[PDB]
Amino acid sequence: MSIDEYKSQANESMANAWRIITLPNWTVEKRGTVRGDVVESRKVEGFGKVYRFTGVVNCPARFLYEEFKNNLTKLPEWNPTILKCEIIKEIGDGVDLSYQVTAGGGRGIITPRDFVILRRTALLSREGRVVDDNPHGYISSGVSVQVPGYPPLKEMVRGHNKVGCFYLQPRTVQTPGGKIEDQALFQWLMCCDLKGKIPQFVLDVAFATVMLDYIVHVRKFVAEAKARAEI
Template sequence: MADRRHIREAAESLLGSVTGPHYCRNLSHSQSINLVSEDLVAGHRPHGKMSTVRRFFCLFVTFDILFSSLMWLICVMMRGETLEQIVEREIIHYNIKTSLFDIVLVAIIRFVVLLLFYGLLYINNWSIIALSTGGTCAFLISKVFFYDWPNASTPVYQVFLILASFTLSWGETWFLDFRVLPQEQQAKYILEAIGGHTSERTPLLNTCNERASPLRPPGVQSTYGESTVNWFSPVETPESSPKRRRPGEQLILTQEQGLVDCPIKFLHDEFKNNIVRIPEWNPTILQSEFIKEIADGIDLTYQVTAGGGRGIISPRDFVNLRRVAPMTKDGRVTDGEPYCYVISAISVKVPDYPPRSDMVRGNNKVSCWVLKPKSVQLPDGRIVQTTVFQWLLCCDLKGKIPQFVLDAAFATVMLDYIVHLRKFAANAKAKGLF
């Protein structure tokens, strides 16, 4: 029970990301992919570890010290001196007018300072690198004035060493200020937009916009208006386990129970016969077409889904082979009184509906809705017929989208769907359609 309660609370925490029935659709597919691949993937810190873009910055700083040291060795070895003579002249008897080792020393200082503050302490401020670059530039300018250029043996290499040190220091500043910090901040914003920002003081259950519902037992408050549902999804692999989800492996989400205040026959007929009207009441579906009926309860459909994750995931289209069948309790198709209705679908290829050039074709590996009748007793003693809505989803959206983004987006879409379905049923009941 403790694990079940934990799963429920984790799922309901995703409700913070649902801001309404609309979605941000102002990003093109190419912009969405670039946003994910650059700002989100590079700036994301998996399990609190160093982000990819910051790790590249630390590698760049390491390259700085190695390149400066190599250039210094080339410059001093051109004199034809032995290693002992080089150490004595450049380091032991250091003179700013004749020695170039100070440029290597400045690179060493930059290496230590930048890795300490940005690699170990993981600060998110530009002040430290501004000081290191400013100090480097001030020293190099002074070096140009003090160095004995007329007696330089290889002035071309020495000039190149100074210019390389100047360029590398400014390159580090540019990369940190225009790449590392913005991408990490953008990744943080995107993840908060998808999964909602929570802290140890943030309530796990949203209790705003409470409205009475005849389906809720007396004295029990809804945690999300009328959208409260029980959820189940496979528990994540423990951190100590060596088994992790492979790249491209899809998470199967199951919405275990969601009560809809309408008879099962009404919901069944709506899904089976009025699929083209779904976008009228469900903004998560932009387009829904009936292609062809193959047999009784078996048909081909085409749908375009709205983008998810506030524009991170662009709209996708699907061509599905669908079957609507009444089932007995033991899972057999029946012509009599059914225990439930099963609406299953899988992606197929249809020649008349090829992939569109302006949209990514998703792959619906397995999708299944189960509608079960349930009698609910109201506080006044009346019995009403409702429908238990269950949803199994395993979908490959294609594109370069991290799995953790898909997991959060799928859960949010499923939550939105039950919200819109309940609103649709409430409006139909108000119009006397059942």
């Protein structure tokens, strides 16, 4: 792949993720423990069933964006669902390739899987245009690609991310004690291949559980940053 082919696919993927994650009319799949946390699903032509987590995280959106953008290889340190994360190559315009190994779901349906991910990280306007400052939202998009040198392993299922992203929107709130503090609306789009003949209602529970279980670790990471006066 020319890096133009990869750069093209990163742009196409980022635009599809943003377009999807902002579509109207979703179906509730599972509500979380914290007020407002929800996994929803819907049908999207050309992708099939997609999942979206929405919830609020007690940190600036820019802070989380910069952790995902600049510190992807540190993810395993605070998120035990991520076993390994390696950058393969950075090819410009906040576009890179990575190798990621995920743990199995807390259910036995989603097994350990590894991924070869093409990502774009960017700042977006409300119209989904890339901007240099004053963003509406911060996006980190993912799609699975093939990279020679990272073949499927016989010992591990190679997952296929069809379209996905994190999409973080800045919020500033008033606390009960009257303080003004930055928070973030955290949205996460997921759309996996999962192979074989497992019933969709079984897959829907398994994916919504994966997404709620991940958010626990995000909240823990944020709470430790707050404790240390990093935010």
